[PDB]
From TrEMBL:
Species of provenance: Melampsora larici-populina (strain 98AG31 / pathotype 3-4-7) (Poplar leaf rust fungus)
Domain of life: Eukaryota
Keywords: Signal
Stretch of the intact protein here: 40 to 163 of 165
Designated name of the protein: Secreted protein
């Protein structure tokens, strides 16, 4: 039955589905923008809070097109406490750069599991073109 957890994983699955959806359509990021319309979180882009529309703007300009070339994995959610939170992070495919370090874009979607049992997009952060100090 469509209970709260079902709605949580349904949401997550629908989101992931549209992210991994057909290349036949313009952009998975488009469907994502369209998904996050009623689910408008605090979109932090490069550290600045953006709404769905601003995201949409960067999207149309080609900024978030790296989002489906990104790597995702199973994030930690083992310690279920009371009022959960998930932060799914994608790292856009790292591209060979100059200084023996690599350029990538990071995307962290923070969702909280509302005490109601459902989950909603708390805030999502996109940090485009980042790197990390390489260990030498």
């Amino acid at each position: 039955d469509m209970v709260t957890d079902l709605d949580v994983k349904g949401l997550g699955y629908d989101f992931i589905d549209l992210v991994t959806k057909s290349p036949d359509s313009v952009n998975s990021e488009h469907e994502l923008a369209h998904f996050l319309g009623p689910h408008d979180p605090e979109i932090y882009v490069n550290g600045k809070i953006q709404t769905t529309t601003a995201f949409l703007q960067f999207f149309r300009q080609g900024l978030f097109k790296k989002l489906k070339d990104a790597e995702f994995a199973i994030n930690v959610s083992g310690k279920v406490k009371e009022g959960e939170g998930y932060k799914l992070v994608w790292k856009s495919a790292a591209q060979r750069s100059h200084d023996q370090k690599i350029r990538w874009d990071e995307a962290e979607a923070y969702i909280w599991r509302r005490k109601d049992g459902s989950c909603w997009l708390h805030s999502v952060k996109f940090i485009m073109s980042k790197a990390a100090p390489y260990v030498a």
